[PDB]
Amino acid sequence: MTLPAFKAYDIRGRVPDELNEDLARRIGVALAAQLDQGPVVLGHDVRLASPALQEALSAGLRASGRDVIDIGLCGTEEVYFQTDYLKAAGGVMVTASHNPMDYNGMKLVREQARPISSDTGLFAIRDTVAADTAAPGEPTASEQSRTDKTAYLEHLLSYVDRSTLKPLKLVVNAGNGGAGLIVDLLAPHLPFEFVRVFHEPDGNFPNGIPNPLLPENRDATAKAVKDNGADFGIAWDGDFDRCFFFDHTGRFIEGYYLVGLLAQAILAKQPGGKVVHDPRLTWNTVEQVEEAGGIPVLCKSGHAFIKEKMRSENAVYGGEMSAHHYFREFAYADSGMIPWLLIAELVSQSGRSLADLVEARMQKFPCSGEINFKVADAKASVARVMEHYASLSPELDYTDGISADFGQWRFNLRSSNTEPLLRLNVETRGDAALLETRTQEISNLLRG
Numbered sequence: 481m482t483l484p485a486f487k488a489y490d491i492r493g494r495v496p497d498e499l500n501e502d503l504a505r506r507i508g509v510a511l512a513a514q515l516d517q518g519p520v521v522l523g524h525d526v527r528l529a530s531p532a533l534q535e536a537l538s539a540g541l542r543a544s545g546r547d548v549i550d551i552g553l554c555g556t557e558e559v560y561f562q563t564d565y566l567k568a569a570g571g572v573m574v575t576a577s578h579n580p581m582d583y584n585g586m587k588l589v590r591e592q593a594r595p596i597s598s599d600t601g602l603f604a605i606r607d608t609v610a611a612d613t614a615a616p617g618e619p620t621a622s623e624q625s626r627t628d629k630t631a632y633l634e635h636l637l638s639y640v641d642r643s644t645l646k647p648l649k650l651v652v653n654a655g656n657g658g659a660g661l662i663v664d665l666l667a668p669h670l671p672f673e674f675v676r677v678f679h680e681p682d683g684n685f686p687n688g689i690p691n692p693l694l695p696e697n698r699d700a701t702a703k704a705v706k707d708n709g710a711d712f713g714i715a716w717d718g719d720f721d722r723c724f725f726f727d728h729t730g731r732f733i734e735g736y737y738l739v740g741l742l743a744q745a746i747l748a749k750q751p752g753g754k755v756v757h758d759p760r761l762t763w764n765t766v767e768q769v770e771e772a773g774g775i776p777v778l779c780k781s782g783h784a785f786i787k788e789k790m791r792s793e794n795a796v797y798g799g800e801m802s803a804h805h806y807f808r809e810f811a812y813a814d815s816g817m818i819p820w821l822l823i824a825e826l827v828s829q830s831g832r833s834l835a836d837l838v839e840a841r842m843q844k845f846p847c848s849g850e851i852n853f854k855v856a857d858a859k860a861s862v863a864r865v866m867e868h869y870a871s872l873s874p875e876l877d878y879t880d881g882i883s884a885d886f887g888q889w890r891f892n893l894r895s896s897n898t899e900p901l902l903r904l905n906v907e908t909r910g911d912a913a914l915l916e917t918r919t920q921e922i923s924n925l926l927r928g
């Protein structure tokens with residue numbers, strides 16, 4: 481067989497059977513053989529096993545003559561940022577992001593924080609690790625501790641005009657992951673009044689694993705916003721490369737609408753820029769990008785496709801509906817911090833609530849949300865859907881699965897690249913009734 485921890489985009493498995501210190505050391509050795517010359521940045525999240533896995537990675541890297549730059553406990557985006565900023569050969573973040581207690585993992589990047597994925601080196605590393613029975617060598621390179629965050633913090637703050645910010649009251653919910661450290665380092669430089677929820681880093685996760693999409697976790701941010709009259713609320717996953725927004729009513733804002741909102745915010749600073757978006761939900765993003773004078777660029781779903789497209793297009797911003805936001809100035813990488821700073825600046829400058837910034841867009845382009853289906857035969861299920869709709873002659877696009885545009889409504893239906901699932905997204909032109917009837921019709925076809 482093959483090591484199951486090696487996934488499409490990263491390494492993730494249960495400790496110690498799928499991932500352990502020995503495997504981590506072998507990954508470090510194998511990674512050294514894949515990178516161009518230079519040092520390697522290492523960081524880790526709040527999980528209990530994360531430091532020991534990073535230490536093993538470092539031991540393997542240094543046995544292979546790689547200098548290591550230890551940036552310590554951090555968010556994933558800090559590995560991306562420091563890898564690029566320090567002109568490193570590559571970087572590894574030790575993290576399980578949002579997963580359970582017995583699980584950990586790694587996200588690997590090369591120069592300029594370019595992704596290393598299954599077909600761009602990650603499976604090559606897997607195969608090297610799988611066959612490596614060599615004795616651990618001893619270190620031939622050094623490790624340096626670089627825990628200064630100053631350049632990262634300055635970079636984050638450079639996205640906003642601090643003189644235009646208003647003293648908004650913001651709920652912030654780190655979910656006992658790592659985001660609170662950065663909020664607290666940014667706070668002396670911002671006028672906001674923070675209401676801190678689940679703020680302390682705690683790898684035992686007393687308040688639940690850090691996954692703001694779980695309704696019970698969602699409600700903790702919503703309640704804090706409502707009870708404190710906050711302007712909005714922000715929650716992060718554990719490694720804080722995703723952020724999640726709650727308006728002043730406590731309503732969680734579906735991520736689709738943030739792509740168009742953030743695109744408009746960025747285009748005010750970089751006029752005429754290209755904006756990359758995914759194919760799942762599109763109409764609102766295309767319109768808002770064009771209305772702000774930008775050029776929208778359709779791209780297959782997945783961070784590696786989006787980053788590659790942004791690079792080839794010099795795109796200023798790219799966004800996925802699923803809370804991933806990528807910024808050219810940030811080494812084309814995703815940040816869970818830049819988005820809320822941009823939104824706080826937009827609320828401050830415009831005098832409009834976050835609710836009102838999105839309300840008309842949500843009415844104009846209602847969407848189903850991503851609905852997942854585990855079916856007996858995905859290919860037969862997809863064929864049942866396409867046969868049912870054939871007589872309507874939709875405009876079809878195979879950029880990523882099947883996109884079908886019927887005029888007043890459209891869907892995207894695709895197989896996940898990460899799990900054996902079918903994923904459905906539907907949207908309409910301002911018609912909630914059509915959205916529901918079509919979503920239910922497709923759902924019935926898929927399950928039949």
Ligand SMILES: O=P([O-])(O)O[C@H]1O[C@H](COP(=O)(O)O)[C@@H](O)[C@H](O)[C@H]1O
Nearest residue numbers: 489781782783800804896897898899
């Ligand atoms: O959810 P994550 O953090 O693993 O995120 C990863 O998988 C997601 C879902 O991919 P798919 O729909 O093909 O399964 C991608 O959108 C995302 O860019 C990628 O970083």
Ligand SMILES: [Mg+2]
Nearest residue numbers: 577717719721
């Ligand atoms: Mg994450």
